Design a protein around this ligand. Structure first.
Ligand SMILES: [Mg+2]
Ligand SMILES: [Mg+2]
Ligand SMILES: [Mg+2]
Ligand SMILES: [Mg+2]
Ligand SMILES: [Mg+2]
Ligand SMILES: [Mg+2]
Ligand SMILES: [Mg+2]
Ligand SMILES: [Mg+2]
Ligand SMILES: [Mg+2]
Ligand SMILES: [Mg+2]
Ligand SMILES: [Mg+2]
Ligand SMILES: [Mg+2]
Ligand SMILES: [Mg+2]
Ligand SMILES: [Mg+2]
Ligand SMILES: [Mg+2]
Ligand SMILES: [Mg+2]
Lengths: 257, 121, 213
RNA sequence: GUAGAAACUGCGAACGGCUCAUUAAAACAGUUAUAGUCUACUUGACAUUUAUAAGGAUAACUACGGAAAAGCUGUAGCUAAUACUUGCAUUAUCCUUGGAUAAGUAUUUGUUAGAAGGAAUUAUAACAAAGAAGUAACACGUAGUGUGUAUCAAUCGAGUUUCUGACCUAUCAGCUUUUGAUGUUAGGGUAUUGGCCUAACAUGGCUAUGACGGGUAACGGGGAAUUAGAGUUCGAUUCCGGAGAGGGAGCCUGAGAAAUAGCUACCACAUCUAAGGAAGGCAGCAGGCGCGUAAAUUACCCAAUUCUAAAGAAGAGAGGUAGUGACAAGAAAUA
């Protein structure tokens, strides 16, 4: 036969899900949708392992049968739906609102935003297409098509999107002084600004970022997400504000009882 | 008779219709206050008029003796118990009593039924 | 050797048993689908004409129309063919089947009636049986009862002997393709949705053309 | 209005589980390309040349049957559909009415113009010829959903592909090319590139830095044992990749197979028979024979981990639980 695989084994699941190596040979195996498997979590993980509202898988099912969970203002009943980075989650029965973010480690957390902040999100552009009749469509990291994009929006910058109507509110550029969150290896939740851009011709582009403690790190261009202009961020942040300390200082701080 | 209950990591779950919590029971120099007594104390502790909305499971007695750990579960009413509790728990509580035990010999019936044709099988 | 005669007009059939070489002589070496007189099978069959429709041999293998031999052959069958039903989709199987020429090696005939003779052969030309099930598509009902548009169709569906639960109720089949307000609601809703999409597209186009400044 | 044996229709059965026979620049590992391609379910955008509602025909079923036997089926009479088919009504753009009409989504051929990538025969636009397939004759009672549908984008994947990296043997020194070996031109074929294949043409391609052969009680890797530091030896076997279903070769359906609890034939082995014929594949789970120095129960359950479906509610020897068990590992009586 040799077709598409349908099962996922536990020790082969992405490590940032933090699954018990005992109790089971399998993992939920997220469905196909707006996010990649390795850059997302299935809804069962969020709703049982993190929030602890459910005890088993079937309890997640009984929760989702009654239409009380919404992602991006739409109800979802799929137990393996992918959730992903900047999405908002609303639970009517508890009247709660969350936004997923990376912490200073490489793992996802629900951030518990307020009701007013629950009406938008930030999307970063991946490419811009020109189609019949000369209209321009932007494709976001969210796997989303936005027609009639403003002519000044380019490939790597981010945009702010209303959720009741799929319209654009404003857009944020990708420059030397913009504020950034990094989303891949060796620095997955750090927030810094930007120092320089390299532009190697045939290969990857490297950019450098400076912390608010004057610490500097670098990464690839493809795992850089703009979250604000020079001064302030446009969303609330988790408690560390993306400041990563080394292990000696972290151990010293933790030793306060 | 003489025991103390300490309820830990208490949490309310409006998505389901229950409260869920951990438990620890201190009974020095005696052994294993019964599950029936714990329900009655919890009903008083939580003003639970009735008693048939409480579910307890996973009790261990902690080598050495004198203390026990477990889990507990308190429901909004009886209808919420039957809606979303499994059948095996619902039998231990006595709410239902069904033991249809036809066995795994339905595989025999399944196999010798597909070889017969539309009308008779 | 065993004959099954069926009357298609009156929906009735009758079988007779024959152990004789003399009586079956006219039938031999005839293909299936061609007429043959029935005088020799009985003096009361004088003036009767039959047609051959099938049969099967001593071992029980059926006959098929295409093959022009007098004995058994071995073919591989597909979905559209006659003496085969697949277990999977796209499955094809090789089976053994009998030719379409009549011979002594048969065990059944399966022939039908065309013409009456001089007698009446009771049980084959006297009785008649109905459809056993009435139509369900509405246009079929109105074409059956030769109605016009104004005539409501719901009042002419018939159960034959139905008095099942009440004293006399005649529970009737549900009929499809009836004109209901629902249908109408579907049409008006679809038209409204189309117009709304048109208006929204015009709005968006005008707005974007404004923004290009 | 509620329930519903049979049956048609839809989706899955290409995932899972097992084993290590083949295999020495092959497979595999780290690094690349697809500007040379295909892609079901799921997610987002969103459409073009009788209508108060069209057609005929078939299961299940009834009656008459055949055969020792099989998941065998003949003739006659009925009847549905989101099965199989036909087809209605509608505006948009350029110059505060009219005119030209646009009359065609993908795809193919000819002539041109030209926001992005390092690089375009690129998005895209015009002119002249062809042109698939579609835009609801469907169901629920929640403005809301379910099912279906042209093209683009995303997602779950695959096919090819760049560079570098293996054990012993020279009592294996020259090899390949008539019959594709190495290149060029034009075609055919494929989802695409390619001697992948055909025709014409040229004489090339590899090699002591070990070609071409022989051997392996050789599947590769993540890893394991022992070691002060160097090293030497192992890796059938929890995860990833590859290959196979007694041995070979063909094929249908399908988004996906050269599938084997799918089909066709030969070789070997083997089952029932009224002697005409019919039906096979434990390297899946238990279990038996044989082989040998060498290895366990013809048990219970879907409660947990997950998967499939018309997706709370069914099923799963996947999986879990016990039974056997001085392989290996830890604690620890005989005062
Ligand atoms: Mg295979
Ligand atoms: Mg569970
Ligand atoms: Mg497999
Ligand atoms: Mg040639
Ligand atoms: Mg190995
Ligand atoms: Mg071996
Ligand atoms: Mg094994
Ligand atoms: Mg494997
Ligand atoms: Mg074998
Ligand atoms: Mg095969
Ligand atoms: Mg088998
Ligand atoms: Mg075979
Ligand atoms: Mg076995
Ligand atoms: Mg042993
Ligand atoms: Mg349903
Ligand atoms: Mg049940």
């Amino acid at each position: 036969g040799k077709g598409i695989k349908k099962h996922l084994k536990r020790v082969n699941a992405p490590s940032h899900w933090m699954l018990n190596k005992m109790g089971g040979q399998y993992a939920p195996k997220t469905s196909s949708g707006p996010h990649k498997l390795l850059e997302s979590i299935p809804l069962v993980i969020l709703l049982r392992n993190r929030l602890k509202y459910a005890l088993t898988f079937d309890e997640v099912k009984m929760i989702l049968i009654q239409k009380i969970v919404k992602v991006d203002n739409k109800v979802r009943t799929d137990c393996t739906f992918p959730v992903g980075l900047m999405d908002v989650i609303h639970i009517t029965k508890s009247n709660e609102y969350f936004r997923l973010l990376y912490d200073i480690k490489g793992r996802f957390v629900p951030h518990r935003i307020t009701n007013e902040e629950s009406k938008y999100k930030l999307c970063k552009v991946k490419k811009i297409l020109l189609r019949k009749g000369r209209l321009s469509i932007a494709v976001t990291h969210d796997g989303r098509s936005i027609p009639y994009i403003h002519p000044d929006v380019k490939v790597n910058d981010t945009v702010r999107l209303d959720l009741e109507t799929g319209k654009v509110l404003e857009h944020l550029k990708f420059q030397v002084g913009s504020l950034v969150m990094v989303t891949a290896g060796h620095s997955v939740g750090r927030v810094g600004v930007i120092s320089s851009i390299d532009k190697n011709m045939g290969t990857y582009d490297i950019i450098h970022v400076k912390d608010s403690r004057n610490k500097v790190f670098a990464t690839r261009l493809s795992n850089v997400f703009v979250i604000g202009d020079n001064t302030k961020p446009y969303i609330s942040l988790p408690r560390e504000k993306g400041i990563k300390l080394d292990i000696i200082e972290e151990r010293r701080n933790r030793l306060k009882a | 008779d003489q025991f103390t209950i300490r309820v830990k990591k208490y949490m309310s779950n409006p998505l389901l219709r229950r409260k869920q919590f951990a438990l620890e029971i201190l009974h020095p120099n005696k052994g294993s206050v019964a599950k029936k007594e714990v329900k009655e104390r919890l009903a008083k502790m939580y003003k639970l008029n009735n008693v048939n909305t409480i579910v307890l499971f996973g009790f261990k007695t902690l080598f050495g003796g004198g203390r026990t750990k477990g889990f507990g579960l308190i429901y909004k009413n009886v209808d919420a118990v039957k809606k979303f509790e499994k059948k095996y728990r619902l039998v231990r509580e006595g709410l239902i009593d069904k033991e249809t035990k036809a066995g795994r010999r339905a595989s025999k019936e399944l196999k010798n039924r597909r070889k017969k044709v539309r009308g008779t099988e | 050797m065993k004959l099954n005669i069926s009357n298609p007009l009156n929906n009735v059939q009758k079988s007779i048993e024959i152990d004789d070489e003399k009586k079956l002589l006219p039938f031999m070496e005839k293909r299936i689908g061609n007429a043959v007189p029935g005088d020799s099978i009985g003096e009361e069959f004088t003036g009767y004409v039959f047609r051959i429709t099938g049969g099967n041999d001593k071992q029980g293998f059926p006959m098929i129309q295409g093959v022009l031999t007098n004995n058994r052959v071995r073919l591989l069958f597909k979905k559209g063919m006659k003496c085969y039903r697949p277990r999977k989709k796209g499955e094809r199987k090789r089976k053994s089947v009998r030719g379409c020429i009549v011979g002594q090696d048969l065990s059944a005939l399966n022939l039908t009636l065309v013409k009456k003779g001089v007698n009446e052969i009771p049980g084959l030309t006297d009785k008649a049986v109905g459809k056993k099930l009435g139509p369900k598509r509405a246009s079929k009902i109105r074409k059956l009862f030769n109605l016009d548009k104004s005539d409501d169709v719901r009042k002419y569906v018939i159960g034959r002997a139905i008095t099942k639960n009440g004293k006399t109720k005649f529970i009737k089949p549900k009929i499809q393709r009836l004109v209901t307000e629902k249908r109408l609601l579907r049409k008006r809703n679809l038209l409204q949705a189309k117009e709304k999409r048109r208006l929204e597209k015009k709005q968006q186009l005008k707005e974007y053309k404004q923004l290009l400044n």
